[PDB]
Symmetry: D2
Subunit: 474 residues, 4 copies
């Protein structure tokens, strides 16, 4: 275990209070790590600001080359990154290695290429006797805050576009899951000029707040809870900082009577429980048309019941633990509240596992109504609810009657219906006859309380630049 911070091209020990990092599969401490002191937070931001003078002036080609080298370093170290993430998060090692690592490497390669492909408006004389042109310049110092559910992947989503755009970055991983970020710190120390990338460690109150509130920080990019989002916005209000957030989701899964039910089941067994449901696009809120409602519930219940939980290093393990005791307790609470409703039935699961670590049984709840908390509020655990609906107009309005707006799916064999519904859903992404698939070229980002700004795609790159108009009188 690497445990040093990266500040201005050097690896240094944190000077703040030591913090424990746990293995959620066993509930044991992996190690205690000193967090950044206030002076180190300040030194990180100042180093990034000083490095911006030269970095912000580099060509896209040069930045692309640094991104390609970083992608190669992560690829070369894929096994070690997968092992660390598996130990820190409890993710099944085969999933971390086969799914996450290649996606992370690709994000950096994609953005290396995108850095050189920025669009604009044609230059020309829009006012007689004056030539106008449009540029896209970097902002300056970006503070990035990564969540604990996909520590390395989210670090990549924030680092890649920011750097590609020519900004310098100060990254703060979640205090719960810093291991892969600190390994990255070690490996990436010499790829970019000193201060262009800085990596800190610590809690929101002791490290995150001084970071996001620093006068030299121009943009704050956050993936986390709505509460944390609200706090950051209020905390940066005084300096009008640009913000980029992704705050959570409660993806509606709309299943019509003509859907391939076997495919929906096979799909949700994966998409509602992958990463133990700790995914902002988890297929957690199912709306099933009255005609297939009971068949779907019965078949899905049987499929969810076979999900195998066990050691993350076991190839047969499909379901890992929740990230912490606190999160385990919150998931349990949401389930009990759904049960106290009187009209929700536990089809399978609905209880914590006996034993060490923070495992919760794969759970399916049926009979949930539109206005119930289990349908209106994110749980972020291995829990899926099913609600019956009558018709298309009704279900689209129910799905759109939500505070969330990140992702959604519609399941139907009818061409007309698939396009009608996709056109009307107020969600950043809509999959048809699938769910959960992301690619580096297509944007991912929400609407409403899910936030704003995109991760991945050229739009993700654009978010980290400012458009400028230069007009020459001639």
């Amino acid at each position: 275990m690497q445990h040093k911070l990266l500040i201005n091209g050097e690896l240094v020990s944190g000077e703040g209070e030591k913090q424990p990092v746990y293995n959620p599969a066993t509930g044991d401490v992996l190690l205690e790590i000193a967090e950044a002191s206030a002076e180190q937070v300040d030194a990180a931001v100042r180093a990034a600001d000083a490095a911006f003078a030269e970095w912000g002036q580099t060509t896209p080609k040069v930045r692309a080359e640094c991104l390609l080298k970083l992608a190669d370093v992560i690829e070369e170290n894929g096994q070690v990154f997968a092992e660390l993430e598996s130990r820190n998060c409890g993710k099944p090692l085969h999933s971390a290695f086969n799914d996450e690592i290649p996606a992370i490497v690709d994000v950096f390669r994609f953005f290396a290429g995108a850095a050189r492909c920025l669009n604009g408006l044609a230059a020309g004389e829009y006012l007689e006797g004056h030539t106008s042109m449009i540029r896209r310049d970097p902002l300056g110092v970006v503070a990035s805050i990564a969540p604990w559910n996909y520590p390395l992947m989210m670090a990549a989503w924030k680092l890649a576009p920011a750097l590609a755009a020519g900004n310098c970055v100060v990254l703060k991983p979640s205090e719960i899951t810093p291991l892969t970020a600190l390994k990255l710190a070690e490996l990436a120390k010499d790829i970019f000029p000193a201060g262009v990338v800085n990596i800190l460690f610590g809690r929101g109150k002791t490290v995150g707040d001084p970071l996001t509130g620093h006068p030299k920080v121009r943009m704050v990019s956050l993936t986390g809870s709505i509460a944390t989002g609200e706090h950051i916005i209020s905390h940066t209000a005084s300096s009008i900082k640009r913000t980029h957030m992704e705050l959570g989701g409660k993806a509606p899964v709309i299943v019509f009577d003509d859907a391939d039910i076997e495919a929906v089941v096979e799909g949700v067994r994966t998409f509602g429980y992958y990463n133990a449901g700790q995914d902002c696009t988890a297929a957690c809120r199912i709306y099933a048309q009255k005609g297939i409602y009971d068949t779907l519930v019965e078949k899905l219940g049987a499929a969810v019941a076979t999900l195998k939980s066990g050691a993350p290093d076991d190839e047969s393990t499909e379901l890992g633990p929740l990230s912490s005791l606190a999160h385990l307790e919150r998931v349990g609470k949401a389930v009990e509240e759904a049960k106290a409703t009187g009209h929700i039935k536990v089809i399978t699961g609905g209880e914590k596992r006996k034993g060490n670590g923070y495992y919760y049984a794969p759970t399916l709840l049926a009979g949930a109504l539109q206005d119930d908390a289990i349908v209106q509020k994110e749980v972020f655990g291995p829990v899926v609810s099913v609600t019956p609906f009558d018709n298309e107009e009704q279900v689209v309005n129910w799905a759109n009657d939500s505070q969330y707006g990140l992702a959604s799916s519609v399941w139907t064999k009818d061409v007309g219906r698939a396009h009608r519904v996709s056109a009307r859903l107020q969600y950043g992404c809509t999959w048809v006859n699938t769910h959960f698939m992301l690619v580096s070229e297509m944007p991912h980002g929400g609407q409403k309380l899910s936030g704003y700004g995109k991760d991945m795609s050229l739009y993700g790159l654009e978010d980290y630049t400012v458009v400028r108009h230069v007009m020459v009188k001639h």
Copy 2:
């Protein structure tokens, strides 16, 4: 004399407390207008939300047709609009009619065309066996808050793109200058379906806050002060609303030894004093190279001294009054502070005019240093300061060491220097050998405390949509 609110396709009287509207050229009350009550603010947002169901689904062609009709109505009523704005704001009538009206009409015509020209990423299979496409959908209800310096123009800048994008709008003009917006309410009542456009009137605390804080409002667009900007961001944090903000400027005007001094003088006499300097891009902060400094100051001083102030309806009037008694006092205070500095010389002006109305003399201050308040803080009055500089590296770093980032100009005959400086200035716009020129197709917007988001251009339209990814498994 129009004084009614536009709510859900009907013209109704405000039900709140009456508020006086002044003629800044005489200091006399033009009339008292009842502001919107709390219930009316709520009714406007609810009508916009209800109208969005259909409006948000219209084609670009249909929206473009509405925008062209509005442009024609404004053009046909050009003289009336120019008279109202001159009476309410004190702008010379000839300027309001010859400069503002055509620009306003053009904003609507431009966005009518832009509504039909939105870019995206090519649709295709980025993941084997899945077709992806990118759409740009509207957000919903937009709350727009217009400032008092260019009431009708800023109303146009907020209405046009929001509507072109398919959103419904609730607009609140400044309590100081509602006349043109209320005339627009009368004229535009039947062009869009009921509830698509709503226009209210009232103070920030009484009407603005209830409006921007409404749960169904998805985006808030503001042009105003930095202080107002911080207040709105804090106010909307709880619901993660999207914001779009232009908050003020202090445009650096960089004059090198090889500039055409006669052109700089003729330029600044207009750009530093137009609209009495109440313009976020006013040429107010001059950095002049030591070689030409004394020559520039003496010639500028003599040119500024001939600016003619008088009745706004007189064709010879070049300089109108400031917007209010309060603003006149603030401007006066900033000048007195500059003078108490001990090292700033008043070349001309520096006093309020005797007589009725809120007139302040066209003022030129010389010897101001980089760290003086007159250089670091927006005055927003008929006041220009000049600071000497030694070299290119020094002055670009000075200019960039600002909390502002809206607009700027550089004056030099050298091709190399013009491009070098333009490339490095941290301002949304940089003019070369001119200043102050805007066109509908080129974006206008800031960086840093000046805010974010663009007015005008296709980027201005894009700011009012959300990018969505639809992916079909096939």
Copy 3:
């Protein structure tokens, strides 16, 4: 009727040989019109070339305003234009007036808007110390050759984008259908500066050849037959002229077993026979899956048999005559060849109408095989053929094994199949569960022998510009 040419802002009589223009509904001559002489063709190109000096430098705003004026003039003369087109082409007057006129007006309004929204690459430093920008400038003089099937529409498709881009145009309508273009000449004479738009009249050999071969012509835009396309390309080879070509089609209409047969029938009754099948996107080549084949043929046969042929000015007329005696002869030949095959059955029609004019009976042929001439070669008449198919892979390969590539449709209720087929069809346009719908913002243009270049959309505008890279060392 107007019969004068528009050359350099003047209306002048042709100085060449007189040529007859026929009313295809009666076979009688509407009038004799003198064609442009050699010297007039040359004078038109020289006028366009001289006008380009100033026109090529105008702003988009100015050009947009001229296009809006032209749209207004056509709109105000809608009835007259519809009547001329109906008399010259035999199109049912109600169709010309209700369908064509509004689309024509829209093309001009669309391009007025698009002229101001041209994209490019972001300006910036791609090579250290050098600022690059991308412009889109006009080419110069464009020669446009319009076909006889939609004379005014096609004239608009060529004029609007070329002018919007800043080029000067010399337009030559078909010798068969010049009436609407010569009326346009009259009405549009004063909208653009002298020489910016020129309209000639005459045959391909006497007027078209000297026009397209003029050394000052930079681009030739043609809608016509493959043979004509080949001739023009060979004729312009020596000067490397840019070409833009739409040469014919044979839209495959692929109907799967799960399609809505009643919708297919109702659809094809219109799409296969509108404008008497003289439409490059006519639904003329049906591939019908073996399950629904017999049902489709019988129902389509009955539906096609009720199409009403009669006087163009009678509201109940649905089918007009073919455009010329010669085209009537060619259509009859192709049907007789299909019949001599021995395996093709005439379900309905298959003969010329007795009486005056060039009417051909609405015709449906069944049992056509992939390799038959009726499936492989364009007929451009009121004739539709049906070919049975077994499976998806087979039919997509059949449809793609064609020299044509303009448009296509697929009819199926299955989401997956609709996207799979749409993705693989080698045709510029693919409609799903409809056919024949065009809008000003979406491009229309082919592949393979159908040609290249787009009409309508922003792409249609880009085709009339040249991208330029300006790079300033600094």
Copy 4:
């Protein structure tokens, strides 16, 4: 060494007549290579056509990865490639290695990135009840013909975008310079699926004609002479093939009285003579303002006279020989033609060098007039001409009065002038205060007889796709 063709994933000997390849520095034969037989040309195209079925459906990510691997292979083999090109073309080894190789590797890396960043129009409902989307699909089989001046680089410019777009390619290098392409064939054999890339060898008439005329070829990309361009266009007319053409240049270099003369001289000494002037962007046609005309001529004459000719493998060699005996004679004829004029002076050079190889002395001609052949016709040798001019309007009109339109440069210190002239030049590229600089992200391509279509940049990638509109009724 390598002399085999690449056909359908296999390296095979040509079956046609043996052809000699010369070392232009010594005039000796390097070797005899069997060219492709007619059957081999047909097998190459059929292989490409069959590979397209699968290749044309790959994802951009997959194609990008193949391009990155090819870039890596070229980079690793940089020295070998540089040595072959130097031996085959006579280019100074140090220039081929330090300039060409890194640029070639970057073309492939740039397009790997650009393959994943294609733009389109937003998908949505442009017609009520119908969802439209825009795709960019590949064409099919692309025939590429590379010239002899930059064999490998031109091969890369043709291969990279075509492959990135999803097409299969059949490449033919010039008969005089096949060595690098055949080495590439060996190295690239296993990077793409069989038949996706094919490389042939032979003469224009025996190999190039059967290739560009093949019915399955959909696009022909040529860099070569105007005569070859005209022939190809005529040759492919019968099948309406798409063409992409770069046919030669005669770059005007406009030098105003306020230019930095020493920079002009140092620049042209390089740009007028690099690659022995066998460059379509060579700085060969200088227009010098009357004020500095004589000074420029004298200084340039002295600088050009020191250019060192010698063995290509000698690091001190600056100027290599011309490509062939026939090209050397053509260059010598053009010079003699200029001298027979009676008003052109030879400042330096103007004769073939004594000895073996195809060396011609670096030449500067003065007093050339606008209408002289030396000014109007490309020489493509180490020859530069200088013509005096009076004013800006005159010289812009002279420069624009040319059959060429590829590249240009303007030299002046004045901001206004630089932009005015750049705005008006009818050339694909204009450099300001430099010349000859290309980057992978910015397009290179001509207008008029220089051709059309772009190399490099996203536009170069777009040229190899067809835009498609898919519209779903719903």
